[PDB]
Design a protein. Structure first.
Lengths: 239, 203, 266, 96
């Protein structure tokens, strides 16, 4: 009984229109939009009892809802404000008490987009000294110079995502802490067996999914427009 | 608010058990549900308690509800690193769609992993596309080593984190350090950290 | 044979405004009153608690206390669910209780009316619509039956709590229930002679126009009308051509008098 | 909607200059919202008591209104009622 939410991550400017969407093929009549902010439990915003129905929840202010079909429930912010930075959760249900929740959507609303920058990614090859002391090889990845802190780092071996032996900094670090608009850096580790890394036929890839401007966002600045995008770094195993 | 959790947050060593509490004023109180939420992730249901005095279990999680006391406790037995998460309490108005869910603000759990076989070392790793650029990996320290920030504003040090090579039952702490200088060295990288006398500084 | 009735009225004007008031009858005597204004159910008889202990009643009242709040919110939401099917103003009535028979036996009921029409009942272990109800109610019913906890509670109320409670009431209330209050009668005429009978209890009563020992077949009995002091009022009318009022009387038989019929001559 | 019936009657045999109770019994109406006044010579009586509202088997509502009154030769009493089902308020006079 699955519930899908799109997008999973959004960077928006004040006064701009943001539409969060939720989709469920369960044939549930009933759907619900929540937000989660630190130090508060989930709070209901709007909900629905079917196509064409929308209902005010507990904190509806600032939000409009739309249930165009049984399957879709959308949360619309006409004029987004910074206080609407949150993680948003969608849920669905039949006549029962259980609500099945989606994976959540993180939104950040900023005063201005001038500072948005995609990251630069580097992959650091494991130390020969490590290999021979531990029989293990640790790759390190570095996303640097990006803003804001909305990135998803993933490790891919031969076109498949690896989770075993992965560790990514819980939060990114500011590279210029003295700044209200500072850029971020984020590191990650992938440790494998020496035999795995020494295999020349294993392709390793660190991948950063940045969230920035959409093609429907304005861009006055001279430099390349910092759209949502993937930056990645890559290396082959070597004896 | 109507649903309160305690402790707000707690820190345990792996293997140890912990007790999490939910105290609510909701009315009526049909059912109570405990969720586990990993950082920046979703709500995974652990268990749901329905009866006046109810007890449930699910692997290493067991739970009890008392509807007179309007109180629930969630016991985690023999904690594993993976249990690091926020635990969330929810109470249901009704036994149907007509009900509203009432959420606790969570209890944050951190489980310190037991580092079996320490081998503290600091390595130099090189950029694949770049001979010249590098990082310093401080690795294989036990969970009693604090990794502090460096004195230089241009040096960068990430806090520790644990990886799990699941198939091998192997866990290691590590920290990365780099600096946008050419003449920066690793034996110098963790000067402002109190590090073991063991530390392997290679050549 | 006694019927115990809990009668609920709930009015929902618009999405925000509503009120709910209940009264409780055992036969034709009120035993309880619960106004929307009041947090607690009021006893309208000394023995309204029946044979329940204070602890038992406290627990039973709190169950209703919780229900009234819930009921109110539930209807409100059931409207949002159907909308734009049905619209305020909404009028809900409930009639619940049991008919007591000798020995142990009884039948409990719980009927629900919507806009003055009977539409839903609890029967067995679930809510069900009755014949003639509109199909749209099937979704309300699907939802209410989703709620296992309510079901268990309602089955207990009807199957166990009701009968027990009332068998208790009939003991405590014996005195008032078997009360005997005498009727008083008086006569008057409008352009048809009228025989007013007032104050009797219980309700069973006999009133006829008579000339000597003959009944007058035209005698039209009215409806029973209540007094404020929990006794009854009824009147008999008989059409008469003017001048024929001579030798006429109004004879009233009632249990209270003990064969001492009231005999009022014109 | 359903129209209210109204019936005025005394608790005791009416007797000039002697305290009595006057009842007004309104029945058969739906919805249950109702404005009931008791009148002496077209003036609203102050101390008027109201039984709790109830309903019959057919689901129609009924309520009893009573007040203390001393009946005289020259005074007229009434029961006056407003209800959605009615364009104009219905007044029923007391008659012996
Ligand atoms: C009843 C006869 C015995 C009484 C003996 C006692 C004598 C003294 C009584 C004096 C008081 C007078 C009160 C009279 C009122 C009439 C009583 C009628 C019985 C009510 C039964 C309620 C039982 C309790 C359950 C309860 O509280 N449940 C409510 C909350 C239940 C919640 O809490 C419970 C724990 O407390 C359970 O865990 C449930 O699982 C949970 O959902 C819930 O809100 C019910 O779902 C409301 C029932 C309303 C009846 C529905 C009729 C269908 C109408 C549909 C119309 C559609 C219109 C839409 C446009
Ligand atoms: C409660 O009693 C019912 C049967 O009694 C009828 O329904 C009540 C609500 C009330 O109105 C009574 O006066 C009625 O006579 C039981 O319901 C039966 O349950 C069995 C098994 O669950 C099922 O096979 C039957 O279909 C049900 N009967 C009917 C007519 O629907 C119910 O189990 C009783 N519950 C308890 C807790 O005693
Ligand atoms: C709602 O109903 C009540 C009673 O009829 C009325 O007094 C109130 O003003 C109404 N208000 C709205 C906003 O519908
Ligand atoms: C009836 O009672 C509830 C709670 O007691 C209240 O919120 C509501 O306003 C009341 N309705 C009226 C008309 O007084």
């Amino acid at each position: 009984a699955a519930v899908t939410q799109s997008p999973r991550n959004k960077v928006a400017v004040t006064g701009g229109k943001v539409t969060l969407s939720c989709n469920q093929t369960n044939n549930h009549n009933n759907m619900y939009w929540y937000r989660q902010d630190t130090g508060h439990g989930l709070r209901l915003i709007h909900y629905s009892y079917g196509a064409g129905s929308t209902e005010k929840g507990d904190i509806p202010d600032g939000y409009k809802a739309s249930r165009p079909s049984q399957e879709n429930f959308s949360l619309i912010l006409e004029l987004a404000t910074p206080s609407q930075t949150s993680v948003y959760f969608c849920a669905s249900g039949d006549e029962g008490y259980t609500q099945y929740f989606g994976p959540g959507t993180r939104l950040l609303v900023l005063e201005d987009l001038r500072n948005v920058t995609p990251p630069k990614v580097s992959l650091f090859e494991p130390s020969k000294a490590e290999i021979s002391h531990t029989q293990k090889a640790t790759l390190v990845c570095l996303a640097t110079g990006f803003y804001p802190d909305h990135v998803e780092l993933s490790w891919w071996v031969n076109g498949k995502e690896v989770h075993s032996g992965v560790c990514t900094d819980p939060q990114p670090l500011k590279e210029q802490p003295a700044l209200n608009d500072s850029r971020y850096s984020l590191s990650s580790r992938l440790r494998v067996s020496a035999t795995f890394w020494q295999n020349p036929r294993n392709h390793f890839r660190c991948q950063v999914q940045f969230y920035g401007l959409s093609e429907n966002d304005e861009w006055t600045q001279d430099r390349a427009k910092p759209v949502t995008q993937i930056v990645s770094a890559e290396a082959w195993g070597r004896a | 608010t109507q649903v309160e959790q305690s402790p707000q947050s707690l820190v345990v060593r792996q293997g140890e058990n912990c007790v999490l509490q939910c105290n609510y004023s909701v009315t009526p109180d049909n059912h109570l549900r405990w969720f586990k939420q990993d950082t920046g992730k979703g709500l995974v249901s652990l268990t749901v308690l329905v009866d006046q005095k109810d007890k449930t279990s699910n692997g290493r999680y067991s739970a009890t509800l008392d509807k007179d006391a309007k109180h629930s406790t969630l016991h985690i037995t023999a904690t594993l690193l993976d249990d690091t998460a926020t635990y969330i309490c929810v109470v249901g108005d009704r036994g149907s769609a007509l009900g509203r869910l009432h959420f606790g603000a969570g209890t944050q759990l951190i489980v310190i992993p037991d580092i079996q076989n320490p081998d503290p070392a600091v390595y130099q790793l090189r950029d694949s596309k770049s001979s010249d650029k590098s990082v310093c990996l401080f690795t294989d320290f036990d969970s009693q080593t604090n990794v502090s920030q460096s004195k230089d504003s241009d040096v960068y040090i990430t806090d520790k984190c644990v990886l799990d090579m699941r198939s091998m039952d192997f866990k290691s702490n590590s920290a990365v350090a780099w600096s946008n200088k050419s003449d920066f060295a690793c034996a110098n990288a963790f000067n402002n950290s109190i590090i073991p006398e063991d530390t392997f500084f290679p050549s | 044979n006694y019927t115990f009735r809990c009668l609920q009225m709930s009015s929902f004007a618009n999405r925000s405004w509503s009120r709910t008031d209940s009264v409780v009858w055992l036969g034709d005597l009120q035993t309880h009153r619960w106004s929307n204004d009041s947090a607690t159910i009021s006893f309208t008889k000394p023995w309204s608690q029946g044979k329940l202990s204070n602890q038992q009643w406290e627990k039973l009242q709190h169950m209703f206390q919780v229900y009234r709040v819930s009921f109110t919110r539930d209807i409100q939401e059931l409207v949002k669910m159907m909308s734009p099917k049905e619209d305020y103003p909404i009028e809900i009535q409930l009639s619940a209780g049991c008919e007591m028979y000798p020995g142990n036996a009884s039948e409990s009921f719980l009927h629900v009316a919507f806009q003055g029409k009977y539409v839903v009942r609890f029967w067995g272990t679930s809510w069900q619509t009755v014949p003639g109800a509109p199909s749209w109610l099937d979704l309300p019913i699907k939802v209410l039956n989703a709620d296992q906890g309510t079901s268990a509670t309602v089955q207990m109320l009807l199957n166990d709590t009701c009968p027990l409670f009332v068998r208790g009431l009939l003991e405590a209330g014996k005195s008032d229930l078997e009360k005997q209050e005498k009727p008083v009668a008086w006569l008057s005429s409008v352009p048809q002679l009228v025989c007013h009978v007032s104050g009797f209890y219980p309700k069973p009563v006999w009133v006829m126009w008579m000339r000597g020992d003959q009944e007058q077949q035209g005698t039209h009995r009215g409806d029973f009308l209540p007094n404020a002091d929990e006794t009854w009022y009824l009147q008999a009318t008989l059409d008469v051509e003017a001048g024929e009022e001579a030798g006429l009387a109004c004879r009233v038989k009632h249990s209270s008098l003990g064969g001492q019929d009231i005999i009022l001559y014109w | 909607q359903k129209t209210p019936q109204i019936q005025v009657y005394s608790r005791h045999p009416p007797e000039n200059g002697k305290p009595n109770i006057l009842n007004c019994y309104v029945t058969q109406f739906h919805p249950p919202h109702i404005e009931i006044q008791m009148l002496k010579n077209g003036k609203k009586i102050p101390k008027v008591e109201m039984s709790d509202m109830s309903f019959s088997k057919d689901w129609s509502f009924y309520i009893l209104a009573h007040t203390e009154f001393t009946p005289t030769e020259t005074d007229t009493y009434a029961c006056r009622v407003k209800h959605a089902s009615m364009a104009e308020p219905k007044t029923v006079y007391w008659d012996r």
